Design a protein around this ligand. Structure first.
Ligand SMILES: *[C@@H]1O[C@H](CO)[C@@H](O[C@@H]2O[C@H](CO)[C@@H](O)[C@H](O)[C@H]2NC(C)=O)[C@H](O)[C@H]1NC(C)=O
Ligand SMILES: *[C@@H]1O[C@H](CO)[C@@H](O[C@@H]2O[C@H](CO)[C@@H](O)[C@H](O)[C@H]2NC(C)=O)[C@H](O)[C@H]1NC(C)=O
Ligand SMILES: *[C@@H]1O[C@H](CO)[C@@H](O)[C@H](O)[C@H]1NC(C)=O
Ligand SMILES: *[C@@H]1O[C@H](CO)[C@@H](O)[C@H](O)[C@H]1NC(C)=O
Ligand SMILES: *[C@@H]1O[C@H](CO)[C@@H](O)[C@H](O)[C@H]1NC(C)=O
Ligand SMILES: *[C@@H]1O[C@H](CO)[C@@H](O)[C@H](O)[C@H]1NC(C)=O
Ligand SMILES: *[C@@H]1O[C@H](CO)[C@@H](O)[C@H](O)[C@H]1NC(C)=O
Ligand SMILES: *[C@@H]1O[C@H](CO)[C@@H](O)[C@H](O)[C@H]1NC(C)=O
Ligand SMILES: *[C@@H]1O[C@H](CO)[C@@H](O)[C@H](O)[C@H]1NC(C)=O
Ligand SMILES: *[C@@H]1O[C@H](CO)[C@@H](O)[C@H](O)[C@H]1NC(C)=O
Ligand SMILES: *[C@@H]1O[C@H](CO)[C@@H](O)[C@H](O)[C@H]1NC(C)=O
Ligand SMILES: *[C@@H]1O[C@H](CO)[C@@H](O)[C@H](O)[C@H]1NC(C)=O
Ligand SMILES: *[C@@H]1O[C@H](CO)[C@@H](O)[C@H](O)[C@H]1NC(C)=O
Ligand SMILES: *[C@@H]1O[C@H](CO)[C@@H](O)[C@H](O)[C@H]1NC(C)=O
Ligand code: CUO
Ligand code: CUO
Ligand code: CUO
Ligand SMILES: [Cl-]
Ligand SMILES: [Cl-]
Ligand SMILES: [Cl-]
Ligand SMILES: [Cl-]
Ligand SMILES: [Mg+2]
Ligand SMILES: [Mg+2]
Lengths: 655, 229, 207, 229
């Protein structure tokens, strides 16, 4: 139903405005205390708390009341007898629900209904461009639009640069703003949380707590690789909550209801949130005690159930037993926690503490900061400090686990060779083997699906928004393996990436690399015949991607951020390959279990007696450690042959 | 400032306290909830924000807290000894009992403090004006975040901010410091030929069937409307 | 014997006090040595224990291990005849112990705390052994000098150019670096064979 | 700095720590016990003295801690992105693999940091030189007490002060920060036609009836005398 997709459009306009523009038949109307749909008492009675969230504020995904409202609205959508009825219900309620809550419920519905595919949802920036584009640019667009219409011009393009949201020369954190503010990355974050909401009916996801850990671990690890590429120090956890948050953030964003997002000054304390009403408050020492309780459970190897029984934590579970990493994840997020009263709601509330830290006692009648919303939170540098803390809790748990045994790491298949080759991307240049590039390229999208730029009904106006994105050429890799047995063997290849050196230029040991490994590709191969086989994978096939400014749809790691930036001189990365005996992997599938019984990120999330990744891999014929160089190009044409006349002489052989 | 304090007393608030120890964060922030016609929302100031060095762009245009403190030290000295030093090297007496053709000391201090036509910009500086800008930029004093100024930076908006009155209580304190150095008015300076015998105050008619008792004034809230077009 | 719990003189009352203690089973060790000379040689065996890994799971180097080495047994043997000899010591004979809730009397490292707790999964320790040429050792003897001229804890209280304990030991044929696992049992009976019927299936080979 | 550290290790002292967090007081003071030929005794610095804004006489000649910090921020940025901004607006690449006729990045950073022939005084400032003066005047940074400078203010005396080496460890850290941005030397850049086969070091004769073993060097204290007249 492409009529279904239309429901995502013009979210700040009335249903009448949308229907009129789109020729959608409306149900009966009335005048609210302007033209609004009549809301059937029968529908209303089914809506639970959906209507309790007032218009004119964002959907605050980490807040329990807001999430309950999205859950309650989506329930009606998901349970509708047919897609026709779904559309009818959506059209009818649209005027009566908070628009962000409406949108969130609709995206969640595509994940939850079996007859809908998340890949068919519109790209989020085309629906809510105000979440991704600076206030000044949207306002400039409104001006350019008004002029265009007057001068009979049906199309306008506006654009912007990072130089306009902060000053890199005085703010090192701004050097990585292009990545944190990447609209596809922020959209991925929204999709992840709506595919895997912590408020989901328990059991309707498999290992959701573990996936919470795993996706965010990869998100933090890749951010750090971007930081190293930029000569920044890796992110530091925000763990001592007595210390003010050193780096503030001014998002320069304004919602379609004209509500500018709150900012956070440098050196702002993480403070008790005294809510309105006061009985709904939460406190720093409360979160600290939840943390103390959780650290205790992790350290002794079991959690206490609210029913009084003890639950063992293990990543070597019995058949039918939960994974310890999953139990910790559900307790920490929190989602389906074994004991809310004891372990609390640390991660979600922390978003809200940070998001309200500019006015924590609600004295000043202000809005929340971007940490309060899933589609904006990644923009804030403190997101990654908060998630480094969260990943530290998970790593604390992982370290309590015994190293994988020889049997747990053994395999029938031998890995013999690994090669990586960048595809053709510019005439008269062929990339050397094992070298990948990144560079910046513009992308443009049509924002008129999200914002009505018309002055009056008959105006024909389209506003395109153009901006720069990190990008990389396609690449492929080939793994050479040997099956020395007498029959066909199927295997899963597990490929991970990490920088070789830390910020000090020191080779990272095995223990340090555990905090960095990120999924490149994890997939099952065709059965391998006895003898040698070559397995070739293209970068577009990667397990971390799903299936025009928006290459991959639904829930996907951004294709354009698939390769860490790297450096001008070339930055060296480990490329770990393991052959193990037998729709982004970061997102999982709502209706199916995780097929692989091994913990996510296996085997590179446990301690080893081996000091180095080299020593570890050398112990196992089914593992090989390859190495690639990643080089960022300020000017992609620089790879081309230059006129002999224009080449300059080097003083020291190379220059 | 005086009338503000009368309003505070009317509301059971304590009189405003000068912001004088600039190493103490400004306790009360202010969120103006204002946006200019160019779509530019005015910056706010969180509670407990420090008064900090303003590192301008370009950096050579910067000003510093201890710089303002030294201007203050110099001005306090001049007030306390009863003369300012002119940039031309000569001393200028401060007195509110001036000779014919002599400036008033209160005027000289005012020009030095604002500052306007200061006798010595290099020595006494520009305390009051720059103070507005320090407070108005205190949410982002090193200009790292590409932000707008707060309302203390503009004359048509600065009075909105509670810190306006803390800043002006400091300023009034400087002026009162100077006033206290002056000798009391002499009998001759206060004497007059006219005797005052009586005083009465009477509120005019404003509501039918009520006549205000003598020496009683009222206040109340009333709506007003204007054409914004 | 310590508190008089009698109300009046003629009362016959005994108060027993019961509580839990860490404990360990007896153990023995055997050192195989060679005397390649032509006459009998007497030696002192010096045996020390330290964890292999720090709290971060990183292998501790020589310098870090210096802060951890603890005496297991330091004692003189009978003279060793030319050729190979086996020297076996029981844990109750340890130099750190002296000679019923109170196993060893006088001044003694507690026998019940002779073995570090260890972990449920098993915790790995270095077991360093040195053969040197020639009443708890922690307490000394009031009336006698320390018999051994070497500093207490020798040789593992000084710096070395060697980066690891492995490298250090490899330099010296009279030193060997052994390794033991120490495992704490929440329920000691857990080591027993369980009914085939009651065994649960593991997802990942072990559980 | 490196040789000082070797002397420290020889004495069972910890290697010198950079003075980089300028919010923290300088722990170790220094009393030089020196007096010039004009009878002017050099100022000392007590233990635990803060690095503070220098309010000069005249005040317009002052410099400020946060000013130096912003110069440092600007320089760290240039180092991290691999180029400096010229006062003429153009960008200058930093590289220790220069083209023929191109300056060395380490040289450009040095001229900017000292500062000497800086590409952009207004942006990168005069960090190292002014730091000597901040430290040398830290006993009386607002010039209230009519005092002389400490030994950090003069090249023939500055090395005496332990803080010299804390300041220079900071300076060397900036330079090392830059060096780390450079790619490792390539095989060709390190290759050579000559093979080194052996090295031996031998102390010469210095005392009768002793010959130093190979590869052993000695130090000791000896008196020296000079004519001060
Ligand atoms: C930009 O996006 C919007 C999609 O919302 C397009 O607007 C539609 O255009 C068609 C063709 O004129 C109309 O029939 C629809 O009514 C429009 N939809 C809405 C909601 O207004 C627009 O065409 C796009 N512009 C371009 C160049 O593709
Ligand atoms: C518990 O300890 C005390 C030792 O002090 C024992 O008390 C003695 O018991 C004997 C036998 O009845 C008496 O003759 C002594 O007079 C007691 N000594 C004192 C100081 O009271 C007691 O017997 C012990 N109980 C047991 C069960 O062994
Ligand atoms: C609006 O303008 C576009 C070109 O920008 C044109 O293709 C389209 O036909 C116009 N719409 C109408 C209804 O005329
Ligand atoms: C508590 O919940 C767990 C979940 O498996 C269950 O096994 C156990 O029986 C419960 N405890 C009690 C005493 O109800
Ligand atoms: C190899 O294949 C056999 C037969 O399927 C299987 O039992 C075994 O687990 C596989 N792996 C290893 C390491 O033996
Ligand atoms: C691996 O592949 C590369 C390039 O294809 C080749 O040069 C190298 O020799 C191979 N190594 C092995 C062990 O086959
Ligand atoms: C990979 O995806 C990108 C973006 O969609 C596309 O440009 C490219 O052609 C794809 N490569 C292949 C061979 O599918
Ligand atoms: C400084 O200016 C004042 C102006 O009132 C003047 O009276 C005085 O003579 C001047 N000083 C000198 C020495 O020029
Ligand atoms: C009253 O008036 C006289 C005459 O004008 C005047 O000179 C004098 O200043 C006044 N005297 C008093 C009592 O103040
Ligand atoms: C002043 O006027 C008031 C009221 O008009 C009156 O009460 C009082 O007697 C008068 N006082 C004198 C001295 O006239
Ligand atoms: C070691 O001492 C303990 C406690 O006294 C005792 O139970 C055990 O029997 C002793 N072992 C031997 C063989 O002496
Ligand atoms: C700035 O100075 C550099 C020094 O080499 C010079 O190359 C460049 O042309 C100058 N920039 C301009 C625009 O004058
Ligand atoms: C060796 O000598 C040749 C001849 O001068 C020269 O070209 C070369 O650079 C030298 N070094 C090496 C490492 O080849
Ligand atoms: C180096 O010199 C020393 C002393 O002269 C000598 O003992 C040693 O054998 C030499 N090594 C080689 C490789 O010639
Ligand atoms: O959770 Cu994905 O934002 Cu903290
Ligand atoms: O001056 Cu301070 O605002 Cu009238
Ligand atoms: O510079 Cu700092 O003293 Cu040689
Ligand atoms: Cl309340
Ligand atoms: Cl400041
Ligand atoms: Cl500047
Ligand atoms: Cl001055
Ligand atoms: Mg912290
Ligand atoms: Mg420091």
């Amino acid at each position: 139903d492409e009529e279904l997709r239309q429901l995502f459009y013009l979210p700040y306009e009335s249903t009448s405005t949308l229907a009129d523009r789109l020729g959608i038949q409306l149900p009966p109307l009335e005048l609210s205390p302007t033209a609004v749909t009549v809301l059937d008492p029968e529908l209303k009675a089914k809506l639970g708390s959906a209507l309790s969230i007032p218009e004119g504020i964002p959907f605050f995904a980490f807040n329990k009341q807001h999430s309950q409202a999205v859950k309650d609205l989506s329930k009606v959508f998901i349970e509708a007898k047919s897609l026709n009825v779904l559309k009818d219900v959506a059209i009818m309620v649209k005027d009566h629900v908070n628009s962000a809550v409406f949108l969130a419920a609709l995206y969640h519905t595509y994940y939850e209904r079996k007859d809908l595919s998340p890949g068919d949802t519109p790209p989020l920036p085309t629906v809510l461009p105000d979440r991704f584009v600076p206030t000044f640019i949207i306002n400039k667009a409104k001006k350019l639009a008004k002029s265009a219409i007057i001068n009979n011009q049906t199309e306008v393009v506006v654009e912007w640069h990072s130089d306009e949201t902060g000053l890199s020369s005085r703010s090192p954190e701004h050097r990585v703003s292009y990545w944190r503010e990447d609209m596809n990355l922020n959209s991925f974050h929204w999709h992840w949380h709506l595919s895997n909401p912590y408020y989901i009916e328990p059991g309707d996801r498999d290992r959701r707590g573990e996936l919470f850990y795993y996706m965010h671990h990869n998100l933090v690890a890749r951010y750090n690789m971007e930081r190293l590429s930029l000569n920044l120090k890796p992110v530091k956890a925000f763990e001592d909550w007595r210390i003010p948050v050193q780096d503030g953030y001014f998002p320069h964003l304004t919602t379609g209801n004209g509500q500018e997002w709150s900012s956070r000054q440098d050196s702002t304390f993480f403070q008790d949130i005294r809510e309105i009403p006061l009985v709904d408050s939460n406190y720093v020492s409360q979160l600290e005690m939840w943390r103390t309780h959780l650290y205790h459970g992790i350290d002794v190897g079991y959690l206490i159930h609210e029913n009084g029984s003890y639950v063992r934590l293990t990543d070597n579970p019995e058949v039918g037993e939960d994974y310890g990493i999953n139990l910790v994840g559900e307790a920490l997020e929190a989602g389906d926690s074994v004991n809310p009263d004891v372990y609390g709601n640390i991660h979600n509330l922390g978003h809200d503490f940070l998001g309200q830290s500019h006015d924590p006692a609600k004295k000043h009648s202000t809005t929340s900061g971007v940490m309060g919303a899933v589609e904006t939170a990644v923009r804030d540098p403190v997101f990654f400090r908060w998630h480094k803390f969260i990943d530290n809790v998970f790593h604390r748990y992982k370290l309590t686990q015994p190293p994988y045994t020889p049997r747990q790491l053994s395999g029938n298949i031998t890995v013999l060779n690994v090669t990586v080759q960048e595809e053709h991307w510019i005439d008269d240049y062929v990339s050397p083997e094992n070298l990948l590039h990144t560079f910046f390229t513009p992308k443009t999208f049509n924002s008129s699906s999200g914002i009505d730029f018309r002055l009056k009904r008959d105006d024909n106006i389209t506003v395109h928004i153009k901006s720069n994105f990190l990008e990389h050429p396609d690449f492929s890799y080939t793994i050479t393996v040997n099956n020395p047995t007498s029959d066909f063997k199927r295997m899963k290849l597990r490929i991970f990436l990490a920088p070789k050196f830390d910020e000090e230029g020191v080779k990272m040991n095995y223990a340090s690399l555990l905090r960095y490994w990120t999924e490149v590709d994890v997939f099952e191969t065709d059965p391998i015949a006895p003898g040698i086989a070559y397995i070739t994978r293209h970068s577009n096939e990667s397990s971390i991607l799903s299936t025009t400014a928006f290459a991959f749809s639904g829930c996907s790691w951004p294709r354009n951020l698939q390769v860490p930036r790297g450096t001008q001189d070339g930055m060296n990365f480990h490329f770990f390959v393991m052959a193990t005996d037998v729709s982004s992997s970061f997102c999982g599938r709502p209706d199916q279990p995780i097929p692989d019984p091994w913990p996510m990120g296996y085997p590179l999330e446990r301690r080893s007696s081996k000091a180095t990744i080299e020593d570890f891999v050398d112990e196992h014929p089914n593992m090989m450690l390859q190495e690639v160089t990643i080089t960022h190009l300020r000017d992609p044409s620089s790879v081309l042959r230059r006129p002999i006349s224009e080449r300059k002489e080097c003083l020291l052989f190379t220059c």
